């Protein structure tokens, strides 16, 4: 693959460097063997290597300045020579120097004139899952991340640009919040500020990423508490201090919903990553999303609810009292079991009570259109994660509530042609419309993180657990149709036909049924053998099961699941501000005009410490 | 709201602040500039701000000693302005320098003439949970909370009454005791105590608060074991000292339930504050109430129990030999599925086995009148939480058994009527009067804390929950009835109506019915399909709910509904001594008279320390 390809040219390299005399005592700090190559010896200088690199590369790879000396002495040209292999495309001896903070040699090169505006293009450094560090493409990029404060403004005095972005778009501000060392990172942070040219407007925080971000925002998106913490100071202003009490005044500008998708907000709930949720805890939005669930939020959400019931309700009242039923024809003989009384084919009636039934229906089509008018937006601007990370119409569920619609409008073309299948279309509606109630139960009180188990429960362990409850169902139920097979299934034949046979065994696996049991006539002899083996398996897959759930319940889960919701919850706030018109919902905070501060919206927060 | 109005306010001052110039001045401690705009300038002095502040208020709340020296010296009226605002009526200049321990600034406003007795009535120090802090409304209050000792003496010598209390007639000393930094306010409680004048009485201790508490008596009630430990040696006085023993004897003064409703007792159990629980632990208090429940109270608690189980087994044998039901109409044929043989209308018989019946049902109008005398005190006196604040007859459950006598009134109007429905008032006083007698498994022994688990549950998660277990039950019961509203039901028609599919669809929610299952004939197809959603959603549910459980038993909350249940059995023995007579129960501890030492009772506690 192109793991191999790395793996064997690394071991390629190194053939290389052994089977080359100039690369290796370069390699080895040989002194004496250099001159000998280079002096009495025309060994060609700008040897290239197995990576494209020169003998100056290596001599800086192995921290080698008393070699590194001879190689710039015998050959200035080298330190502009950058490798040409695919992985390391654009790399300079610099970017080397740089990476092992080798201070003497970084001044030597500078010294010698290297450009510290070359960029490694090169596939390695790559912002990638398989590469393990992301240091960007400038040296002066790779001075901050390693953090010698020494070298950064070396760099810069020889004329680095700090402006200058990679080919993503990312400053060297935006390298340091992708970065582990959050304590250490932060006092870098402020050492790159300092070279700003202080005008309030281009300043490098301002800098956007390609994809629309700032450091700011991305520190939010990204989860980086610590820098979140440091660049808040930025845009918080304290009123006055009381006491104890502290009236500080937050901007509040990037983080609200106003700039469009620029809000951070959005990005903290439509992201994937967990450690964003933390980020919405944060004193500053913390107040911000209460504030905005507790009034204004939390009754729009239940009036839908309340709509939501409603409509669901009358039209299960539809259901009913449906058509007439009286059974045309007395088939009856074949298939006597069969017992149908079937509506189908009366095109409606005379309309006393009939009427108000025309008048419910008439609400499926409302639902089987706004509905629609949520469908249409299914696909239309979003349409890939853009709507589950959008939806918020009702958030987890609500992918059934269009298929639900759907189901309305098939019953709808199921009337109007009588077909058998009436009950089929309709019987999926009732079932779906209720269940999708209980995403009602997200927020509201204490079952909201309920749900939440439930929801995951369905759509993650259960699929691949059904499957292995699928198994040994097919052994045993099949097998007591095999049994079963022989007698007379008139009394006692809970397994007539191989789907009753499966039918039967899985009710039989929850215990529902009293197990098949008869004692006027004698049973085969299998069955009660194979029986007791049912019973037991059976008790140890549900015993295993329910000890299996201790997979979560630590308390961290507790504060995780809890962490789960408030965040669900959050993001319910969001994308009803959104869809819901401005007039309704009035902005969070106070405007910084008529108290000419700002020109733009503060909330204002006051806190005790102890 | 009114949140937002503060929020703007805090905002509209700052504004002020800035386009008023001297008091921007202050605020900035321009020194250079306050001088030009009194001396050179007439600016007028006395400049009102947003929140009726002065320019020395300002210089205050900044600490500007500088700036607020160079106001006092050009006008020294302002010294005793007050800010006119009503979020801060009535504070003074001297309020804010006391508050942020401006020392300097607090010796040149009392050598101004500063008034000690201003006080701070705006609503901001209102004693409020939207109030962050609460340091009452006299500026030596505030110098009490704060903790600085240096200023507290200083603003005395000044002539600092301590006895002055604010509008809800707290002292100083009331106020430490609701204040977080429990080690440090002890020190500063003595050190106010210094200047007491010395008498026994009017001691600034025996201060009550309007609402009729004390300070050592709001202590219990507020929860603050700091504070109550250190007021105990006040009034604790120690007997002798051999070897580790130590016999110290106790005052039971404020402790004891003899001043009326001035027990600290009762406040605790009536209190809903959860920090109190912790105080009858404490050794004053864990020995009187033991001694309390362990002799003269646990029998009266089961002799009472005894009386009601009896009461409630002989009320039920007058229900199961009730009136003769020969049925004298023989309808049958309308309903035919009706089986009736109704008692009704034979007002009594002939009275051999007869005659014990009405000596039992004499039996009921006691209960009904003796909770008559129960219902009675319902209203009287008390009602609103002064009874389920008092009620300890039976305390838990207990608003069933007023319910329960009633049902025995009602069926008393039942009968002499001989109505229809003769079952159903006399079938709600079966459940709720045995229902009732888990009330006395309150103490006894080791299921009195199991009882409050179900107690707990039944009026808490269990609603909210249930609204979840309503839902589901109205898509898949409706839909049940809908496959199977086509077919014959004469043969597995668990569903024949609307108000058996619910219910039939309910008893399957929890498996009590093998589930509906005929194998002559064929069921419908949409039957087989939604039964097998049914059985795996309700095992889902169900299990969610046993690991939801998990929510409690961690180890604390063993210790919480321990200390829940031990906390409501002192409850319990707190009203049966004030409802029972005084000749039985006597009272705990030995009199102060025929040993002059107290002529007030003491409990004599010896303990040994290791
Ligand atoms: C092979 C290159 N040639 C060399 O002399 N050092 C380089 C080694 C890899 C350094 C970057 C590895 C990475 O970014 O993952
Ligand atoms: C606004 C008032 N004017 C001022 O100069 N300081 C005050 C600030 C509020 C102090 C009390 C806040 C509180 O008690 O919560
Ligand atoms: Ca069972
Ligand atoms: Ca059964």
Sequence with gaps: ??????????????????????????????????????????????????????????????????????????????????????????????????????????????????????????????????????????????????????????????????????????????????????????????????????????????????????????????????????????????????????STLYDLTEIDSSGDDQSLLELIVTTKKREARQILDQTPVKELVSLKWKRYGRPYFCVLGAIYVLYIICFTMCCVYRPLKPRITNRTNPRDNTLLQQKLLQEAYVTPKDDLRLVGELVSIVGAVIILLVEIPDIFRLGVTRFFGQTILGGPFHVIIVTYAFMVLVTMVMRLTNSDGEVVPMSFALVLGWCNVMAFARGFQMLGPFTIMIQKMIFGDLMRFCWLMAVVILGFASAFYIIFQTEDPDELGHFYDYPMALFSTFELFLTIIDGPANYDVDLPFMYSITYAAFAIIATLLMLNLLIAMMGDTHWRVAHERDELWRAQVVATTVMLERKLPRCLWPRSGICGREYGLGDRWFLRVEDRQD
Tied chains: 1, 2.
């Design 1 to 246: 693959s192109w793991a191999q390809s790395r793996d064997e040219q690394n071991l390629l390299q190194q053939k290389r460097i052994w089977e080359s005399p100039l690369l290796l005592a370069a390699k080895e700090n040989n002194v004496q063997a250099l001159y000998k190559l280079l002096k009495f010896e025309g060994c060609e200088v700008h040897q290239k290597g197995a990576m494209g690199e020169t003998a100056l590369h290596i001599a800086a790879l192995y921290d080698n300045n008393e070699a590194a000396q001879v190689l710039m002495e015998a050959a200035p040209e080298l330190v502009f020579e950058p490798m040409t292999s695919e992985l390391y495309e654009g790399q300079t001896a610099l970017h080397i120097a740089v990476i092992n903070q080798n201070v003497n040699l970084v001044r030597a090169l500078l010294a010698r004139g290297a450009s510290v505006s070359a960029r490694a293009t090169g596939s390695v450094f790559h912002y990638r899952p398989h590469n393990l560090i992301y240091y960007g493409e400038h040296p002066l990029s790779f001075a901050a991340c390693v953090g010698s404060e020494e070298i950064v403004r070396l760099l810069i005095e020889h004329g680095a640009d700090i402006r200058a972005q990679d080919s993503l778009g990312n400053t060297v501000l935006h390298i340091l919040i992708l970065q582990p060392n959050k304590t250490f990172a932060c006092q870098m942070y402020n050492l790159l500020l300092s070279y700003d040219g202080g005008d309030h407007l281009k300043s490098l925080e301002l800098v956007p990423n390609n994809q629309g971000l700032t450091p700011f925002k991305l520190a939010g998106v990204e989860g980086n508490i610590v820098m979140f913490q440091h660049l808040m100071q930025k845009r918080k202003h304290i009123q006055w201090t009381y006491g104890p009490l502290t």
